[PDB]
Design an enzyme around this catalytic site. Structure first.
Site, short mmCIF file in Angstrom:
data_model
loop_
_atom_site.label_atom_id
_atom_site.label_comp_id
_atom_site.label_asym_id
_atom_site.label_seq_id
_atom_site.Cartn_x
_atom_site.Cartn_y
_atom_site.Cartn_z
N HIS A 44 3.00 3.48 -3.20
CA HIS A 44 3.74 3.96 -2.00
C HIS A 44 4.36 2.84 -1.16
CE1 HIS A 44 -0.11 3.52 0.30
NE2 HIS A 44 0.75 2.95 1.14
N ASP A 93 -1.59 6.27 -7.14
CA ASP A 93 -1.06 5.34 -6.14
C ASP A 93 -1.45 3.92 -6.51
OD1 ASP A 93 0.34 4.45 -3.95
OD2 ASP A 93 -1.10 5.15 -2.46
N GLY A 186 -0.69 -0.52 7.73
CA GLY A 186 -0.50 -1.92 7.34
C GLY A 186 -1.58 -2.45 6.42
N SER A 188 -2.64 -0.62 3.66
CA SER A 188 -2.47 -0.02 2.33
C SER A 188 -2.07 -1.01 1.28
CB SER A 188 -1.54 1.19 2.37
OG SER A 188 -0.21 0.79 2.67
N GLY A 189 -2.57 -0.80 0.06
CA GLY A 189 -2.29 -1.72 -1.04
C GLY A 189 -3.36 -2.77 -1.19
C1 LIG Z 1 5.64 -6.67 11.68
O1 LIG Z 1 5.31 -6.01 10.43
C2 LIG Z 1 4.95 -4.71 10.53
O2 LIG Z 1 4.90 -4.10 11.57
N1 LIG Z 1 4.63 -4.23 9.30
C3 LIG Z 1 4.19 -2.92 8.98
C4 LIG Z 1 3.51 -2.12 9.90
C5 LIG Z 1 3.03 -0.88 9.52
C6 LIG Z 1 3.21 -0.41 8.21
C7 LIG Z 1 3.93 -1.20 7.29
C8 LIG Z 1 4.42 -2.44 7.69
N2 LIG Z 1 4.18 -0.67 6.01
C9 LIG Z 1 5.02 0.48 5.70
C10 LIG Z 1 6.46 0.23 6.14
F1 LIG Z 1 7.23 1.29 5.92
F2 LIG Z 1 6.55 -0.05 7.44
F3 LIG Z 1 7.03 -0.78 5.50
C11 LIG Z 1 4.95 0.85 4.21
C12 LIG Z 1 3.66 1.60 3.81
C13 LIG Z 1 3.51 3.05 4.37
C14 LIG Z 1 2.06 3.65 4.45
C15 LIG Z 1 1.04 2.70 5.11
N3 LIG Z 1 -0.32 3.25 5.18
C16 LIG Z 1 -1.34 2.38 5.38
O3 LIG Z 1 -1.15 1.17 5.52
C17 LIG Z 1 -2.69 2.98 5.48
C18 LIG Z 1 -3.02 4.26 5.57
C19 LIG Z 1 -4.40 4.78 5.68
C20 LIG Z 1 -5.30 4.46 4.66
C21 LIG Z 1 -6.62 4.85 4.77
CL1 LIG Z 1 -7.73 4.45 3.48
C22 LIG Z 1 -7.08 5.55 5.86
C23 LIG Z 1 -6.20 5.87 6.89
C24 LIG Z 1 -4.86 5.50 6.80
N4 LIG Z 1 -3.96 5.90 7.83
C25 LIG Z 1 -3.60 7.10 8.29
N5 LIG Z 1 -2.67 6.97 9.20
N6 LIG Z 1 -2.46 5.63 9.31
N7 LIG Z 1 -3.22 4.98 8.49
C26 LIG Z 1 1.58 2.21 6.42
N8 LIG Z 1 1.95 2.97 7.43
C27 LIG Z 1 2.60 2.12 8.30
C28 LIG Z 1 2.58 0.84 7.80
N9 LIG Z 1 1.91 0.93 6.61
#
Ligand SMILES: COC(=O)Nc1ccc2c(c1)N[C@@H](C(F)(F)F)CCCC[C@H](NC(=O)/C=C/c1cc(Cl)ccc1-n1cnnn1)c1ncc-2[nH]1
Length: 238
Positions: A44, A93, A186, A188-189
């Site tokens: 994802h 995933d 942030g 995830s992965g």
């Molecule tokens: C300054 O840099 C920046 O702000 N970077 C930044 C910030 C936020 C992001 C992100 C990059 N990654 C996503 C994207 F789109 F922004 F790039 C891609 C990736 C998109 C999905 C990701 N999901 C997680 O990471 C985890 C979820 C998760 C996992 C478990 Cl086990 C439990 C609860 C969870 N959550 C439920 N709701 N939230 N979490 C995410 N969502 C926003 C981000 N990542």
């Protein structure tokens, strides 16, 4: 990471930070070193990512402030997404990044062992989720790598917690019944690392959850033991 504490330098040497370069450079996802040219992460993470050319892998990082324009990174040659993958909530995933160059192993960057097929019958009691993600739903990426110890939850109990979802044996859940400790945006992965017989194993890949660290909402991870043959297929190709 919600309810975690600062990691110490070199504590999770397989943990990487994957950055995107377009439109501006920023952290995208976590990842794990599993081989000298291989990063295991979540599929994802590449939603909208049209090319591996915009990706940078940083290993040996404790603090995001260590990353500037002069900081060395690994380029990505190829993005390999499980071809059954549709979305995080439906499973599969998992993704591999083939690095353009080789990781030189040391005390700051080294691989995590994959779980054994025989280890599918073992009970892990010392599991930790790590990442630079949010401390709550509305937050920001953390400078220091955080860690949180979380118990694994059975598939039956996780299915009870996610009525309306299909929690498969290709997923593994972790969290406290009362919540409080979890992965968040942030993270995830990144890895769910479990210590067994003094060896760390990559048990899960941070995938999804309903909110962060909520009571009776365990974090849902890709169950890595169920993809060992798929990883070997892709990394040991003749
Ligand atoms: C300054 O840099 C920046 O702000 N970077 C930044 C910030 C936020 C992001 C992100 C990059 N990654 C996503 C994207 F789109 F922004 F790039 C891609 C990736 C998109 C999905 C990701 N999901 C997680 O990471 C985890 C979820 C998760 C996992 C478990 Cl086990 C439990 C609860 C969870 N959550 C439920 N709701 N939230 N979490 C995410 N969502 C926003 C981000 N990542």
């Amino acid at each position: 990471i919600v309810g975690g504490t600062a990691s110490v330098r070199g504590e999770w040497p397989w943990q990487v930070t994957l950055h995107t370069t377009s439109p501006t450079q920023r952290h995208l996802c976590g990842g794990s070193i599993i081989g000298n040219q291989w990063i295991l992460t979540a599929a994802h993470c590449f939603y909208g990512v049209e090319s591996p050319k915009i990706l940078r892998v940083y290993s040996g990082i404790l603090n995001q402030s260590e990353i500037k324009e002069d900081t060395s990174f690994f380029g990505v040659q190829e993005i390999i997404i499980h071809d059954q993958y549709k979305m995080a909530e439906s499973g599969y995933d998992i993704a591999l990044l083939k690095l353009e160059t080789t990781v030189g192993y040391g005390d700051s960057q080294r691989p995590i062992c994959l779980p054994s097929k025989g280890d599918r019958n073992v009970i892990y009691t010392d599991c930790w989720v790590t990442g630079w993600g949010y401390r709550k739903l509305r937050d920001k990426i953390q400078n220091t790598l955080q860690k949180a110890k979380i118990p694994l939850v059975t598939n039956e109990e996780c299915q009870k917690r996610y009525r309306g979802h299909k929690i498969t044996h290709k997923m593994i859940c972790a969290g406290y019944r009362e919540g409080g400790k979890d992965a968040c945006k942030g993270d995830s992965g990144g890895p769910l690392s479990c210590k067994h017989n003094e060896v760390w194993h990559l048990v899960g890949i941070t995938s999804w959850g309903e909110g962060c660290a909520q009571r009776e909402r365990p974090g849902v991870y890709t169950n890595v033991v169920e993809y060992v043959d798929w990883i070997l297929e892709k990394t040991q190709a003749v």
